[PDB]
Amino acid sequence: LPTPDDLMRRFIVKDTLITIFRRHGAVEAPTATLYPKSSHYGPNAVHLLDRNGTVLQLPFDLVMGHARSLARIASGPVPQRAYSFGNIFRDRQDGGQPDVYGEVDFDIVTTDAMDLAMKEAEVIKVLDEIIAAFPTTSSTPMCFQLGHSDLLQLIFDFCNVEHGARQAAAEVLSKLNIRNFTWQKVRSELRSPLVGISATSVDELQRFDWRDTPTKAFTKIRNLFEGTEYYDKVSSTLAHLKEVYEYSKKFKVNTKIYIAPLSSINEAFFRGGILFSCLYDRKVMDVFAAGGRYDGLIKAHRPIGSRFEERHAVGFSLNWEKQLAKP
């Protein structure tokens, strides 16, 4: 049972987020609700609170709130820089709050392919401004952790992890070093018959369980791949990450930026583009927000025999009610 102050604080937090988005040139896009699938292979629906009340059926593996953005992109044109409030449906009898849209999705959607890294850096800068605006995040140490879906897939190739086991492996690795989910628990879950990754493959993956500043991390990844076919296959990804880092320096991002090669949050959604998480940089880490580039999904689930204007999107999703209005 909340106090009136709790509701007022939630309102004020929402207004502050809206203000930060305004002052960065973004505009509001339709509010959306994600209705989860009822069977494993059944679709996930998204309801947009737009002119038509459009409902879109999404693939069975898109169970994460950021899927709402894909729905918007599938429904029609979207603004270049947009934010949209949303939630995931939970039954009222099971503690759902249907009139609280406690999540927000921020996305930059372009039609040109020439400045993808720049747009990703811009999204990171927006996240930097968000953390700067709130006492919960501005007084405690925070960090950004960057990776790339191509880098993760190449690591899986190097460690001889068979496909069809990589989704479960990415889901497990998305928990690494978060809320005391140490590498020992990661290994125990990866070797379990549910995931069934071999002991040698896990031992090889352990060589990528670290984070570092970009230059050192790039040399480390190269040295790990030296003498194998993956040394050359990785260059383009590393160059892209370097470009993102340089643009982030140009945009004067204050939060520290690490390269974490095993970054995996929502990798299925962001295949194959940059992945980034904004975390509380503490003894026990926790995730503040996550995002990445999801051109691949946009291209794959476009509305087939008709030619389409290729559209690129990078963005993040943040459970702002959980992180900013509960304290």
Side-chain angles (χ1 to χ4, degrees), residues 168-169 171-192 195 197 202 206 209 284:
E171 270 153 27
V172 171
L173 290 160
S174 72
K175 299 193 304 201
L176 173 58
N177 291 317
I178 306 286
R179 281 190 111 73
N180 303 297
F181 204 76
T182 62
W183 178 264
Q184 304 44 65
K185 328 225 190 132
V186 161
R187 157 175 215 114
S188 152
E189 197 163 348
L190 288 182
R191 298 233 38 220
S192 71
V195 192
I197 288 159
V202 178
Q206 202 173 334
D209 172 24
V284 169

Side-chain angles (χ1 to χ4, degrees), residues 147-307:
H148 197 288
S149 166
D150 293 345
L151 172 65
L152 184 70
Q153 292 304 325
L154 278 177
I155 287 155
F156 280 148
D157 285 338
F158 178 78
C159 303
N160 300 304
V161 172
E162 80 217 18
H163 309 86
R166 300 187 175 193
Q167 181 167 44
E171 270 153 27
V172 171
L173 290 160
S174 72
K175 299 193 304 201
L176 173 58
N177 291 317
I178 306 286
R179 281 190 111 73
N180 303 297
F181 204 76
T182 62
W183 178 264
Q184 304 44 65
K185 328 225 190 132
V186 161
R187 157 175 215 114
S188 152
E189 197 163 348
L190 288 182
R191 298 233 38 220
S192 71
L194 207 44
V195 192
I197 288 159
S198 86
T200 310
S201 291
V202 178
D203 290 346
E204 220 62 32
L205 279 175
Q206 202 173 334
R207 313 171 68 192
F208 298 90
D209 172 24
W210 49 264
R211 81 191 175 162
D212 223 318
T213 59
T215 311
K216 295 186 217 172
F218 296 155
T219 74
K220 210 169 169 168
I221 290 155
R222 290 209 165 280
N223 288 352
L224 275 170
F225 282 169
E226 198 168 322
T228 71
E229 57 183 315
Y230 303 104
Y231 186 86
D232 283 330
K233 291 162 167 279
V234 86
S235 307
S236 56
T237 303
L238 296 195
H240 183 75
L241 287 172
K242 196 207 215 101
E243 223 182 335
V244 174
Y245 181 62
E246 307 279 74
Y247 271 118
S248 90
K249 287 196 294 193
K250 207 198 132 199
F251 295 154
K252 282 167 181 213
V253 164
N254 288 292
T255 303
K256 179 181 210 187
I257 286 163
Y258 293 107
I259 296 287
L262 289 179
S263 307
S264 325
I265 291 177
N266 293 319
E267 188 264 358
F269 191 70
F270 303 118
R271 180 175 297 167
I274 190 166
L275 313 156
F276 49 86
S277 60
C278 181
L279 318 162
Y280 301 88
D281 204 357
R282 308 206 254 249
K283 204 198 171 335
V284 169
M285 309 211 98
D286 212 331
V287 179
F288 178 77
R293 177 165 292 288
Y294 52 103
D295 304 4
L297 260 205
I298 292 167
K299 191 150 155 331
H301 293 285
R302 50 163 207 291
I304 282 193
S306 79
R307 177 51 221 275

Side-chain angles (χ1 to χ4, degrees), residues 73 76 78 80 108-114 116 271-272 293-303 306-313:
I73 284 157
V78 303
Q80 210 162 108
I108 299 183
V109 172
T110 64
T111 82
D112 173 30
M114 297 292 96
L116 301 192
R271 180 175 297 167
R293 177 165 292 288
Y294 52 103
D295 304 4
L297 260 205
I298 292 167
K299 191 150 155 331
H301 293 285
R302 50 163 207 291
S306 79
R307 177 51 221 275
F308 56 109
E309 201 219 37
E310 239 199 301
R311 265 184 303 170
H312 313 277

